[PDB]
Amino acid sequence: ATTLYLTRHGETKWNVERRMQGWQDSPLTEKGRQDAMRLGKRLEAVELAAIYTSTSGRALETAEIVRGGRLIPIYQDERLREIHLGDWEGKTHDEIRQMDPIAFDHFWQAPHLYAPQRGERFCDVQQRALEAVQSIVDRHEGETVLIVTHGVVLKTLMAAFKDTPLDHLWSPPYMYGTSVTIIEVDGGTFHVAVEGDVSHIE
């Protein structure tokens, strides 16, 4: 019996610059900080036992803003990093379409067909993120915790919980930054209680 609050960091410079991030990082934008503040307010009542995020700076910032001085430990897990995009990182979409037009199309249109030479495949992400989630519920029996991660990780996770095949990874709902998704873990099973709720952000 564990309650998992899930979300992804807000807007970053590269986000608005439409540059792909992955393992490279970039600071939050003013808007990204406001979104986190607002999410931090919505969770002021939830009795969080802890917070897990990736080792990425943009995720850590969001977590610190959300914790806002509350006595809560923040743990960083590599298994929650965004998909490693290899050669695509730090490059814009237009720039990428110039290099690997097909792979780029598969990425968004046929995820299950995405097979980069050095980057990470979607199932690689889903698998390690699942481990993280499992180790997290293992360490928090009878507790509620928050997980701040990234777009893709969040999506592969939702897919595992919804039992959706990876080819339908990008299916709705869209997962906004700092959106709230709640997963209830009873008897070892994952129940999607709330998905992508974006009130507070409005």
Side-chain angles (χ1 to χ4, degrees):
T2 302
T3 296
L4 303 171
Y5 273 74
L6 290 185
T7 189
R8 66 150 156 155
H9 63 75
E11 229 187 65
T12 57
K13 287 188 179 176
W14 287 16
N15 262 172
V16 53
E17 286 185 281
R18 300 175 191 175
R19 285 182 182 293
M20 301 211 105
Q21 283 175 298
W23 288 15
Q24 282 192 180
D25 187 57
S26 81
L28 291 167
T29 63
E30 165 54 48
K31 203 239 164 38
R33 293 166 79 277
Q34 302 178 307
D35 286 45
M37 290 176 224
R38 296 171 189 170
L39 184 269
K41 171 69 202 309
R42 178 173 183 166
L43 300 172
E44 254 178 51
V46 190
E47 303 192 303
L48 298 175
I51 296 174
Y52 292 83
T53 60
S54 67
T55 47
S56 287
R58 83 197 86 129
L60 187 56
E61 239 188 86
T62 307
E64 298 173 313
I65 293 174
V66 168
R67 177 173 60 176
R70 290 170 67 179
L71 188 60
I72 305 180
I74 284 178
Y75 300 111
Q76 298 183 57
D77 197 309
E78 271 85 339
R79 293 165 302 185
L80 288 173
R81 282 175 301 189
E82 175 65 298
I83 175 166
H84 180 275
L85 295 168
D87 195 354
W88 289 7
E89 313 185 334
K91 300 184 176 183
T92 172
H93 292 182
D94 296 283
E95 232 175 311
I96 305 183
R97 288 194 290 283
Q98 252 54 56
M99 310 187 290
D100 308 296
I102 302 180
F104 185 72
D105 184 63
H106 290 332
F107 190 86
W108 299 99
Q109 257 59 277
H112 64 297
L113 258 29
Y114 179 55
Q117 299 195 299
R118 50 210 205 288
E120 210 162 27
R121 295 189 164 73
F122 291 104
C123 48
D124 291 306
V125 176
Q126 189 180 59
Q127 180 167 55
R128 62 178 220 227
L130 256 302
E131 285 183 57
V133 169
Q134 184 53 64
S135 79
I136 290 175
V137 325
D138 282 341
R139 312 168 57 201
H140 294 289
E141 181 62 50
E143 293 176 339
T144 304
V145 305
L146 170 64
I147 301 181
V148 180
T149 190
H150 314 273
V152 177
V153 172
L154 196 49
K155 270 302 191 177
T156 62
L157 283 183
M158 289 317 292
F161 304 148
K162 283 175 155 188
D163 197 61
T164 302
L166 256 40
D167 15 305
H168 289 295
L169 168 69
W170 297 117
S171 298
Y174 181 73
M175 305 297 275
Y176 292 74
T178 69
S179 57
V180 166
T181 151
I182 304 183
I183 285 68
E184 273 292 1
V185 189
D186 290 304
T189 64
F190 303 88
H191 304 286
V192 167
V194 180
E195 177 174 34
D197 186 44
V198 295
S199 324
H200 63 291
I201 308 173
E202 225 66 52

